[PDB]
Write an enzyme that holds these catalytic residues in place. Structure first.
Site: not given
Ligand SMILES: N[C@@H](C(=O)N1CCC[C@H]1C(=O)NCc1ccncc1)C(c1ccccc1)c1ccccc1
Ligand SMILES: [Ca+2]
Length: 223
Positions: A40, A84, A175, A177-178
């Protein structure tokens, strides 16, 4: 990282920052030519930044290397976040030293209860927004499969695990992420997703790297 601590400069020497004009994701250096990150996090125009502590100041230990190729897992589903994981090939080999070092791939999966280190430059608030300059760290245990599935009914695959705290307060966030989840000196997780950050009964969900070692090894042998 919410509820964590300042790691200390270059104490996580496999942690990389992915930069596209700004930091947008973490990653992990697995050898001199390759970074593991989240699918992602895919985008074009990635520069890999190694040896970072403060991502806004050149402190003297950095290596900035453009990506020559990115390879998202063939089976990545951007809706369920299954598989992922993404490999990034550096245009030139990093120079490995005490501040820039690779992290080993696992040979066995980790176990529930194992204490791991999660790190990144993501948001430090569970409500609101604050982004740090220096690398943040969190010690977090792997949670049981049953607690993970209870937290996220219908959404946890065999390629995911939960780590963190069901009481909330301590978690990874946007942020991060990854970036890495390291347990017993191996890269066992990639920061993937969750429902918010540091919320009660919503721990972070991480890509289970041990399921991808064969794909990683074969891909790096041919690219
Ligand atoms: N909460 C969002 C998320 O994890 N997103 C958005 C894009 C980046 C990543 C992130 O921050 N990952 C890091 C992370 C987030 C939360 N806890 C731990 C680590 C998710 C979603 C995933 C991927 C794509 C779209 C949405 C989401 C799930 C349910 C409702 C809204 C959004
Ligand atoms: Ca820097």
């Amino acid at each position: 990282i919410v509820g964590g601590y300042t790691c200390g400069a270059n104490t996580v020497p496999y942690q990389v920052s992915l930069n596209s004009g700004y930091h947008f994701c973490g990653g992990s250096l697995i050898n001199s030519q390759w970074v593991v990150s989240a699918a992602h996090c895919y985008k074009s125009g990635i520069q890999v930044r190694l040896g970072e502590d403060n991502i806004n100041v050149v402190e003297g230990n950095e290596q900035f290397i453009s990506a020559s190729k990115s390879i998202v897992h063939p089976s990545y589903n951007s809706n369920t976040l299954n598989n992922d994981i993404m490999l990034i090939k550096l245009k030139s080999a990093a120079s490995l030293n005490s501040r820039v070092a690779s992290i080993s791939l696992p040979t066995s999966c980790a176990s529930a209860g194992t204490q791991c280190l999660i790190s990144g430059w993501g948001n430090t608030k569970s409500s609101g927004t604050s982004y740090p300059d220096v690398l943040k760290c969190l010690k977090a245990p792997i949670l049981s499969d049953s607690s993970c599935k209870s937290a996220y009914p219908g959404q946890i695959t065999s390629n995911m695990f939960c780590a963190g705290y069901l009481e909330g307060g301590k978690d990874s966030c946007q942020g991060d992420s990854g970036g890495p989840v390291v347990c017993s000196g191996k890269l066992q997780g990639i920061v993937s997703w969750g429902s918010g950050c540091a919320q009660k009964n919503k721990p972070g969900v991480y890509t289970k790297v041990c399921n991808y070692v064969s794909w990683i090894k074969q891909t790096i042998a041919s690219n």
